[PDB]
């Protein structure tokens, strides 16, 4: 088992000092190393106000840019016992899902690039591109938007976005269908993926996998159906549960949630209400710029909110959503101050990597590459 | 509501069908057809210098400091753009200009520190600091990226016409 | 069908002035297509928009030599386009 | 469109026919207007050299009934 220090530029998100002892081409033990991307996200937040810590969440796992923001939002809203306005909720579910697609296009196509199939990535990165443009025309940034803030969305959708999030959705399916005709039944995709990294159901719950990784093993758990957040309760979608959990089965699950998210996006476009996109409590949400420039109470509320902060009531909460990777949760302890006290980010990914050892046993070097792909490891969330 | 993604007789017809699939690589040929199909589709790439990828009015891009039409710079050094910057990028120190008005002696946005959040655009009461459309400001030296008041004011003067159009389009939304 | 495809290719080649004119467009851009000229800015630049082409390529600018006396004919730069016409090129505003 | 992959191919094709036409005309010009005889078995060489010994100092030169 000659340690190969296999890793950094490898087939991971830049940083995997995956030191491994391999008897020839068989892996005896995998000890993943982490922290090549630790940056301090958890300590930095303690020194920043709630609204100026929102941009950190987008960077925690940036393939899933917004879905992460929703988790902090929800958490800060709970502590304040404020809830967003109805239109904002639908928006967050609209962009929440668009983001899930974006993550799955990343996970399925990047999985293939490491496997060696390169054309699916270019096919779907063009669709991704088109989605980014939604982000940009809603937030201003292609990724790292900062659109979902603790009290709702920042600004209403541009006048015309919904129509385009339709044209795209109306077609994206065929694009998923194509990838399929190239990989779902490839006589070769199956081999490198089938029966690789099988994880039992009991073991998946035990190692805290909590994601497709659980769903792929047949455990039925979607925090979006079990514990509804926002208005994911008002929509109707089917969790894609899997059997014979293995790299191929979970994949099929990720392609199926891409499909189910188009079902949720359709609805959101069909039923998004007229209304405001941010709470009306100037206490939590910043006042509209026409108001702060004509009304004294609004300037005072604008000045205090931007300079000092929300001033969340003292308490602590663990709120978890179903980020595309898995359960993303923020444990946000908070003193009465405007800046948080602690904000442990639970990363679906710290648990998944740990499982690499119990998944890739008696496996070849190529198998390890396939399994890192089937966990959608974004080192930002793991390293935080 | 759940769904089984992969949850599952032997007849000559069936077997012969299956054996042909393994022997003559039928599904592999299916995959080749898909790629041949696109080869015939129009490529989606754009001539980058000649044609530019579309950015709508809210694109944050590069920082600029605006001026009133009259010509008086908008910033009045309230310094909350400094307060809400997440990265500590903006450094502002001020003193009363001889006019008696309030102006910033030094306004330095460290763009390498800045993470282009666009909150400064949000926070300014006079809306003096704006996220300008330009994204192409790559520089040979690190020092050029650090920007003082004169570069930003100059950036503001160069892009004021488009900045005004962009703010014009999006202010009702804000 | 393809003969009309061939006539379209011939018109594109004849479209850029003389043989030398298209050679000039050919070398600096590597793409030959004909479009209505929306405007020419005071810094030497020429802008064309074609409705038929897809969203990414329907608006293009053919840069001109020495727009500030820089010998820009070969070292084309994105920043050369003026701020007024930058948003038209990036589709920020439909109006020219 | 896909039209453009053709330029490159053209220069490949043209560079894969040259060799076959070239080798097959530098033979018919360095062997007196006749394919270069292929001496695979001793007998084909014999007649090939016998012919050399027959006339001139080259095989392509072929003396006929008028000799």
């Amino acid at each position: 088992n000659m340690t190969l220090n296999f890793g950094p530029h490898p087939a991971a998100h830049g940083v995997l000092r995956l030191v491994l002892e391999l008897s020839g081409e068989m892996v005896r033990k995998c000890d993943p190393h982490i922290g090549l991307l630790h940056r301090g996200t958890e300590k930095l937040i303690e020194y920043k106000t709630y609204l100026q810590a929102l941009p950190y969440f987008d960077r925690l796992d940036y393939v899933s840019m917004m879905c992460n923001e929703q988790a902090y939002s929800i958490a800060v809203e709970k502590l304040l016992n404020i809830q967003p306005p109805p239109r904002a909720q639908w928006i967050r579910v609209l962009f929440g899902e668009i983001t899930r697609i974006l993550n799955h296009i990343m996970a399925v196509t990047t999985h293939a690039l490491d496997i060696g199939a390169m054309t699916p990535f270019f096919w779907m990165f063009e669709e991704r591109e088109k989605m980014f443009e939604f982000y940009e025309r809603v937030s201003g940034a292609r990724m790292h938007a900062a659109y979902i803030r603790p009290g709702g969305v920042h600004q209403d959708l541009p006048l015309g976005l919904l129509d385009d999030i339709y044209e795209f959705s109306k077609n994206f399916s065929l694009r998923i269908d194509e990838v399929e005709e190239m990989l779902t039944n490839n006589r070769i995709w199956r081999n490198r993926t089938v029966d690789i990294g099988v994880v039992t159901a009991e073991d998946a719950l035990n190692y805290g996998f909590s994601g497709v990784m659980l769903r792929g093993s047949g455990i039925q758990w979607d925090l979006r159906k079990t514990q509804p957040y926002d208005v994911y309760d008002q929509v109707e979608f089917d969790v894609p549960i899997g059997s014979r959990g293995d790299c191929y089965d979970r994949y099929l699950c990720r392609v199926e949630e891409m499909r189910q998210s188009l079902r949720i996006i359709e609805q959101c476009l069909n039923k998004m209400p007229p209304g405001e996109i941010k709470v009306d409590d100037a206490k939590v949400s910043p006042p509209k710029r026409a108001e702060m420039k004509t009304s004294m109470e609004s300037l005072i509320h604008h000045f205090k909110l931007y300079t000092e902060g929300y001033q969340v009531p003292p308490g602590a909460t663990y709120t978890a959503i179903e980020a595309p990777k898995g359960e993303f949760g923020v444990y946000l302890v908070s003193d009465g101050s405007s800046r948080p006290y602690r904000c442990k980010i639970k990363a679906p990914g710290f648990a998944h990597l740990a499982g690499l050892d119990k998944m890739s046993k008696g496996h070849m070097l190529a198998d390890v590459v396939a399994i890192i792909g089937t966990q959608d490891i974004v080192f930002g969330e793991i390293d935080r | 509501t759940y769904k089984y993604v992969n949850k599952k007789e032997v007849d000559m017809k069936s077997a012969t069908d299956n054996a042909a699939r393994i022997l003559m690589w039928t599904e592999l040929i299916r995959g080749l057809g898909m790629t041949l199909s696109y080869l015939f589709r129009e490529p989606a790439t754009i001539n980058y210098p000649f044609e530019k990828g579309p950015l709508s009015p809210r694109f944050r891009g590069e920082h600029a400091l605006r001026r009133y039409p009259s010509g008086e710079e908008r910033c009045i050094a309230c310094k909350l753009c400094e307060a809400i910057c997440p990265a500590q990028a903006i450094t502002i120190e001020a003193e009363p200009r001889a006019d008696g008005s309030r102006r910033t002696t030094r306004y330095d946005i460290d763009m390498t520190k800045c993470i282009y959040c666009g909150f400064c655009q949000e926070a300014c009461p006079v809306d003096a600091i704006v996220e300008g459309p330009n994204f192409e400001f790559s520089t040979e030296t690190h020092e050029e990226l650090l920007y003082n008041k004169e570069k930003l004011l100059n950036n503001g003067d160069k892009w004021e016409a488009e900045i005004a159009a962009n703010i014009q389009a999006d202010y009702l939304y804000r | 069908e393809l003969v009309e495809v061939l006539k379209r290719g011939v018109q594109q080649v004849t479209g850029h002035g003389g043989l030398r004119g298209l050679l000039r467009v050919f070398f600096r851009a590597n793409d030959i297509r004909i479009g209505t000229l929306v405007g020419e800015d005071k810094y030497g630049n020429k802008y064309y928009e074609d409705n038929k082409q897809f969203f990414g390529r329907h608006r293009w600018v053919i840069y001109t030599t020495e727009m500030n006396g820089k010998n820009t004919f070969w070292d084309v730069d994105g920043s050369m386009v003026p701020p007024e016409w930058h948003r038209w090129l990036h589709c920020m505003t439909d109006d020219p | 469109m896909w039209f453009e992959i053709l330029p490159g191919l053209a220069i490949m094709g043209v560079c894969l026919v040259i060799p076959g036409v070239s080798t097959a005309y530098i033979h018919k010009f360095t062997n007196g207007g006749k394919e270069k005889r292929v001496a695979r078995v001793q007998y084909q060489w014999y007649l090939m050299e016998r012919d050399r010994r027959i006339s001139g100092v080259n095989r392509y030169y072929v003396s006929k009934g008028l000799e």
Binding site: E126, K130, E167, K170, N171, S173, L174, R175, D177, E178, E181 | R30, G33, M34, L36, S37, Y38, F40, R41, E42, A44 | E1, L2, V5, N51, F54, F55 | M1, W2
Partner: peptide
Amino acid sequence: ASATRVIQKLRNWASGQDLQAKLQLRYQ
């Protein structure tokens, strides 16, 4: 687009579905 009605049919036959309905070129 600009399939010409023959490249489109090779495209449809090879793909096995109608890309014309869901094109890669976004239009007005």
